[PDB]
Amino acid sequence: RYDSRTTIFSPEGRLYQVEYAMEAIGHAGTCLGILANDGVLLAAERRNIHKLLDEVFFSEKIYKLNEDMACSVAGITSDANVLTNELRLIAQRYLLQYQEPIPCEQLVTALCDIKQAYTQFGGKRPFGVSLLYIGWDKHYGFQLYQSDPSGNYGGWKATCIGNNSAAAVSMLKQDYKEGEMTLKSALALAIKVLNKTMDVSKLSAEKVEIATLTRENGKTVIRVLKQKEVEQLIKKHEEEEAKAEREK
Template sequence: MSRRYDSRTTIFSPEGRLYQVEYAMEAIGNAGTAIGILSKDGVVLIGEKKVTSKLLQTSTSTEKMYKIDDHVSCAVAGIMSDANILINTARVQAQRYTYAYQEPMPVEQLVQSLCDTKQGYTQFGGLRPFGVSFLFAGWDKNFGFQLYMSDPSGNYGGWKAAAIGANNQAAQSMLKQDYKDEITREEAVELALKVLSKTMDSTSLTSDKLELAEVFLLPSGNVKYQVRSPESLSKLLVKLGMTQPAAEAS
């Protein structure tokens, strides 16, 4: 039945569904898992890297984590070419707001503005929805630390903990069980690693298969966005007992 109604984004099925939008959401299920956790002193984002070639310069490139402004970053799951367009759009919007009002753009206003763009691509003919979901992490003076999730339909919502990408339902159920209010950033990192280790496709958890980013406040009051280095991730995994230390060459 769906074949009669899925050739256009503007045609509703008799059940009131837009199949093209649903297909875009299905495409995200093929991407690496990304998890976001809101803590009392920051926001943690962690993602599973699918591209693990030894030739990739990991020190200068990221696959899942992107900085939008000094106070906002995001994790991505889906078609990266689509994500790049939306990330650049969000960066421009954030800078225009800062130029006009001389202060950082509120996090939810930035997310809503980007989701308005995504929703437009589900409404007009000749376009297809963006096949990408985001986890936005940020801080502003209005609501402090915030975590938002958005999907290809343009819908978004604020979350305490959320997962997108492959096996997101299993990750979401684990987060629902183990998340607790007043969680610290260190505990959030440990929880995110625990959930990802049980939901990612790979059998072993190593630093070259992960990206971990954090948004937190410095003692000076400035917002800091930090991506953990592979060396720091390796030490953390060994400390938590989630991987074995590398054997020294004899």
């Protein structure tokens, strides 16, 4: 009725491509991050777990963007390549300008202004990509951020991806943690969330993806960890399911 282009307003006034970009988020890979001090982690779901791929890339959703920041991603894939190139270029231009790493919030607002430049103008497709942010600074420590196709960014401590992850956010609230900064506790919580939310029976470790970010002595290393610790984490969580069925 008032469909035609991204511009102009609807008669209430709401937006068309904004709601539909959100509904383009909802059918994508599920991500989350956790509340942790002395480190921060990411979780990700493998789309297309078919047997004839290569996995030689070591990272399909994580993008180690500067040195001490990576980002997960969700949405239309090749727009995210367009976004990651530009994001790396923005942070690297900042480092060129000051010789100090980017303190991550003006990085987030730069990308939000990039996305908003296609929200206002006409006629261009808005970026249908929401994506996460982990990172470290001199001013707040470990951080977590949620980009949105509107240009809004919300600093969370426990985040939200689309229709697959509302029950995940419900579990994050009903299983809210505070004070426990131990990475292994957060990993067990993430294992519990992805066990419930993903429909992978018994949570095959090839269908998941976990990357962490710790502060080591002055380096802020990013640990895109290997598969054996994921296997024993799954075994840990299934032993804790045996503890949960000690109630029978």
